[PDB]
Amino acid sequence: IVMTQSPSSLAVSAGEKVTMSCKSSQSLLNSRTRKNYLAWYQQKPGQSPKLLIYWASTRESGVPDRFTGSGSGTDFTLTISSVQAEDLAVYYCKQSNNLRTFGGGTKLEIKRADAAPTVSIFPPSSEQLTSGGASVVCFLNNFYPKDINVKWKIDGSERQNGVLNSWTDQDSKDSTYSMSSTLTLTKDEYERHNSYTCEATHKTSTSPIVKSFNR
Amino acid sequence: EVMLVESGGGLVQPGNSLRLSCATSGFTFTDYYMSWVRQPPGKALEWLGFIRNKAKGYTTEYSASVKGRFTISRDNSQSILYLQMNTLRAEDSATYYCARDISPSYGVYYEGFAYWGQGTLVTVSAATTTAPSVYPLVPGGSSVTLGCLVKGYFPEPVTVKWNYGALSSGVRTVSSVLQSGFYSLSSLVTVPSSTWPSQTVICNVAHPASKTELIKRIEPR
Ligand SMILES: C=CCO[C@]1(C(=O)O)C[C@@H](O)[C@@H](O)[C@@H]([C@H](O)CO[C@]2(C(=O)O)C[C@@H](O)[C@@H](O)[C@@H]([C@H](O)CO)O2)O1
Numbered sequence: 464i465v466m467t468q469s470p471s472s473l474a475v476s477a478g479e480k481v482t483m484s485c486k487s488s489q490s491l492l493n494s495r496t497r498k499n500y501l502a503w504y505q506q507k508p509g510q511s512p513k514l515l516i517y518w519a520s521t522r523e524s525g526v527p528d529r530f531t532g533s534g535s536g537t538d539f540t541l542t543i544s545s546v547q548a549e550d551l552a553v554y555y556c557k558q559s560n561n562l563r564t565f566g567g568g569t570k571l572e573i574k575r576a577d578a579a580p581t582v583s584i585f586p587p588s589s590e591q592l593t594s595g596g597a598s599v600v601c602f603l604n605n606f607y608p609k610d611i612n613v614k615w616k617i618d619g620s621e622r623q624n625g626v627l628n629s630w631t632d633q634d635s636k637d638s639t640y641s642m643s644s645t646l647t648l649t650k651d652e653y654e655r656h657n658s659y660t661c662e663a664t665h666k667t668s669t670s671p672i673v674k675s676f677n678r
Numbered sequence: 679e680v681m682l683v684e685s686g687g688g689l690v691q692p693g694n695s696l697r698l699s700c701a702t703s704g705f706t707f708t709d710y711y712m713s714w715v716r717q718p719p720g721k722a723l724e725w726l727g728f729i730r731n732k733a734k735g736y737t738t739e740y741s742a743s744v745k746g747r748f749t750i751s752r753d754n755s756q757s758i759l760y761l762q763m764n765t766l767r768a769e770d771s772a773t774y775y776c777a778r779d780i781s782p783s784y785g786v787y788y789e790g791f792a793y794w795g796q797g798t799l800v801t802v803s804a805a806t807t808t809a810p811s812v813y814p815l816v817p818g819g820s821s822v823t824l825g826c827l828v829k830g831y832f833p834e835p836v837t838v839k840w841n842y843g844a845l846s847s848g849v850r851t852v853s854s855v856l857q858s859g860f861y862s863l864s865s866l867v868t869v870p871s872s873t874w875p876s877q878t879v880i881c882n883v884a885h886p887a888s889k890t891e892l893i894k895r896i897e898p899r
């Protein structure tokens with residue numbers, strides 16, 4: 464049997480209602496037990512899946528009223544009456560009328576008010592320099608939306624090479640992101656210059672935020 | 679307390695074979711179907727196959743995708759479920775879960791997976807298992823942001839704690855990034871300026887693929 468979900472992802476504000484679709488190629492209705500063999504699972508980042516709804520509409524011990532599974536035959540729907548911060552997760556539907564098959568999943572994201580990053584810069588550690596390594600890290604903490612740009616400057620010249628950016632998952636408590644921008648050089652490349660700068664550009668302001676240090 | 683624990687994960691050479699285990703307790707093992715599920719990084723879940731309860735004869739059934747490749751068996755005396763993986767390749771790189779399926783013959787019966795294991799990551803590569811090096815991140819206010827920079831490890835994953843789990847608020851772990859065959863990530867914590875450096879601050883980096891735990895105390899410059 465083929466399982467298919469929609470949407471692949473969506474973003475709503477806290478207090479907003481939401482709807483996720485699940486569709487199968489063959490009726491999941493068992494004539495012998497008179498029940499639809501479809502379950503909904505919730506999976507938060509870095510965790511295992513947790514069962515929310517089974518037999519299409521029966522809620523599992525401990526799961527809030529807000530969640531409401533409906534459907535019959537081949538068309539099903541998970542429905543959150545009102546989303547809050549906890550709901551950050553991908554939601555999977557699973558048929559078990561003929562063996563088992565999972566859907567593709569719906570990622571649930573949250574829209575919130577704009578927030579500005581708190582920018583920290585970090586010179587390389589001693590033990591890293593002792594091993595001939597020099598990594599400079601710019602940390603952008605607790606911002607939204609997720610899109611943000613960081614420019615690096617060495618002594619007044621925009622560096623571009625040896626730079627790797629990485630984001631977190633949307634925070635489960637205030638729904639923000641944090642990101643790190645790393646400039647990786649060798650101890651020689653690093654002792655070659657003195658001024659190290661990173662500038663964070665975000666919709667929150669026209670002029671970027673600056674953090675610098677001198678070797 | 680129902681418990682499921684996957685084991686065996688790590689780095690496997692392409693073309694080779696691997697066996698996973700799943701220790702259980704807290705329930706009558708033989709009463710339940712056991713299912714295996716997998717999940718490639720940032721991908722959907724995939725059911726692989728199951729093995730039935732005693733009443734049904736302990737028979738096996740697999741998914742189209744892994745018929746002839748993956749095998750399920752169970753030791754009923756030690757209450758352990760097994761998964762045998764042969765001729766592994768890249769597309770097999772994923773997190774493998776064991777899950778407690780249905781028990782239609784005795785007790786409470788409903789269609790769903792009530793309990794999942796924590797998962798064990800398998801990555802299929804020819805590269806080298808190399809534990810991570812951990813460097814501190816410290817400032818050059820009323821609060822101060824610290825963190826640990828983790829580079830040069832393989833395969834995934836690594837887990838980062840602080841004060842052995844006691845410090846859990848203000849913690850931000852960024853995703854991993856892959857470059858030159860090696861991964862790297864940095865985890866940061868924020869605390870009141872009174873808590874540091876006057877008090878102790880440690881991060882606990884764990885890399886299961888090498889059975890390694892590194893600890894790094896955060897000291898001033
Ligand atoms: C008709 C097929 C099987 O019937 C038996 C059996 O022969 O073992 C006996 C029936 O009385 C009943 O116990 C079914 C059992 O419900 C089958 O359960 C599964 C299965 O493959 O074992 C698994 C269930 O989750 C569900 O997928 C059903 C499916 O709805 C078909 O019944 O199959 O076993």
Ligand SMILES: [Mg+2]
Nearest residue numbers: 730737738739
């Ligand atoms: Mg059979």
